[PDB]
């Protein structure tokens, strides 16, 4: 059981966009999440992975392949601080009792794709990181089941340094 951030490319020139994909693996009865992601904003700029449009405080990352049935009322929230190199976003079904009744949990999939535009070819790290607003998180990640309870006991797989 895990949540992972992984990059499609680990090398690039100023102006390239590295695509960081946030993925969950074998997360039982998964119904929602919140994650906190930090990067160095002098080296990388969070952007839309397809358009290069820069993230603001309210930008929710595109590209998830889970929690996509509008029947269960997905609600997405973003509260980034790009100036300070912070992404913080969350999404969950609201009608979890209806999702549960269906009995098919979406336990693996993509939850976000995030582009990071290279501002400097300087060695740099992007990582899930704990933050004051998420007490009890697992390295800045909180995953929730269709009972509305916190899920525990999964690995947080951080990406290697971007050299």
């Amino acid at each position: 059981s895990s949540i992972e951030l992984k990059f499609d490319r680990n090398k690039g020139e100023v102006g390239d966009i590295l695509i960081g994909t946030v993925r969950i693996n074998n997360i039982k009865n998964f119904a929602g999440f919140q994650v906190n992601i930090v990067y160095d904003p002098k080296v990388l700029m969070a952007v839309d992975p397809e358009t290069g449009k820069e993230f603001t405080s309210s930008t929710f990352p595109p590209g998830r392949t889970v929690l996509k049935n509008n029947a269960y009322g997905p609600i997405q929230i973003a509260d980034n601080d790009p100036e300070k190199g912070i992404l913080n976003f969350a999404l969950a079904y609201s009608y979890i009792a209806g999702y549960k009744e269906t009995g098919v949990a979406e336990e693996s999939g993509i939850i976000a794709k995030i582009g990071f535009k290279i501002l400097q070819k300087k060695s740099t790290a992007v990582k899930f990181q704990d933050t004051l607003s998420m007490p009890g998180a697992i390295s800045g990640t909180q995953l929730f089941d269709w009972d509305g309870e916190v899920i525990t006991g999964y690995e947080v797989i951080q990406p290697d340094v971007l050299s």
Binding site: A31, G32, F33, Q34, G73, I75, I77, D79, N88, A90, A92, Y93, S94, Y95, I96, A97, L132, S133, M134, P135, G136, Q142, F144, D147, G148, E149, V150
Partner: protein
């Protein structure tokens, strides 16, 4: 067989108590006269007055029945003599001969304070024939245990989400339980317990309304009160669903939207609203929202 009984009463210091003096086995011939003396403890009781009982049929009862209270002597003298002169006001039935009205004194010792027939002359019928009579002493049980008229309606309530000991007292306390159409209510304590005392008997049934800021109102109908009534236990409490934040008796998107306005606020920060911190862990975040979601789309009827 003719019996004179001092009754019993129960009071707290400061209470006014009534101690009946009963006659049983009154002869067919009736009782025309009687005299006796009661002793009491004037440390415990201040005699206020002795009311002639229902058995005293003289239209001017004082003409047939009088008492003399002597606190310094610790004695009450009872004298009865049917005043009509023809037997007309003779006692002819069993019942209350007199009522001792007494105030239990403000700092009186507790315990049973005996009221005893300490001297007995005779009861005599209309023909002046003495009737052989049994004496039974009584008194007042002075304790400090409160007595409430009416009944106790009580129970346990529990919010439906996960929390630990650091916050259990906060989330369990503060549910108001109201008896609808009365001014009677209780508020749950830190254990989720409530009790409303002095509830009038009602076998037709009360409706209870359980309410708290951010919770979906719960209505419990047909609560029959023929005695002390427990509506739930600590092991099987009345569950309450949080998430009615914009109060419309429905958990919907406007409720979630209100939590989002404080998203990621932490205790002590500008945008922190304690009520929106559902689980009271000091942060407003997706975990709180997911608790709201537990009962999404629910209305009070769904309980």
């Amino acid at each position: 067989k003719l019996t004179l009984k001092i009754g019993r009463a129960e009071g707290r210091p400061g209470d006014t108590v009534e101690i009946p003096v009963n006659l049983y086995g009154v002869p067919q011939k009736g009782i025309a006269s009687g005299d006796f003396v009661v002793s009491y403890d004037p440390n415990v009781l201040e005699i206020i007055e002795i009311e002639p009982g229902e058995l005293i049929v003289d239209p001017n009862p004082t003409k047939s029945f009088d008492t003399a209270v002597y606190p310094d002597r610790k004695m009450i003298v009872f004298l009865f003599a049917e005043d009509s002169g023809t037997g007309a006001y003779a006692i002819t039935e069993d019942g209350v001969f007199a009522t001792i009205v007494a105030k239990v004194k403000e700092g009186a010792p507790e315990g049973f304070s005996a009221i005893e027939i300490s001297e007995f002359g005779a009861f005599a019928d209309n023909d002046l024939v003495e009737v052989e009579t049994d004496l039974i002493n009584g008194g007042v049980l002075v304790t400090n245990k409160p007595v409430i008229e009416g009944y106790k309606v009580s129970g346990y309530i529990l919010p439906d989400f996960s929390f630990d000991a650091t916050v259990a007292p906060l989330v369990k306390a503060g549910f108001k339980v109201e008896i609808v159409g009365t001014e009677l209510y209780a508020v749950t304590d830190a254990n989720g317990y409530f009790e409303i005392t002095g509830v009038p008997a009602n076998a037709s049934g009360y409706t209870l309304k359980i309410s708290r800021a951010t919770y979906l109102d719960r209505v419990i109908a047909n609560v029959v009160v023929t005695g002390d009534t427990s509506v739930s236990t600590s092991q099987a409490p009345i569950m309450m669903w949080v998430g009615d934040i914009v109060k419309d008796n429905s958990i919907n998107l406007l409720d979630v939207a209100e939590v989002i306005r404080c998203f990621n606020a932490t205790k002590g920060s500008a945008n922190y609203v304690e009520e929106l911190d559902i689980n009271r862990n000091g942060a407003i975040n997706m975990q709180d929202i997911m608790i709201v979601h537990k009962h999404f789309g629910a209305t009070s009827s769904d309980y």
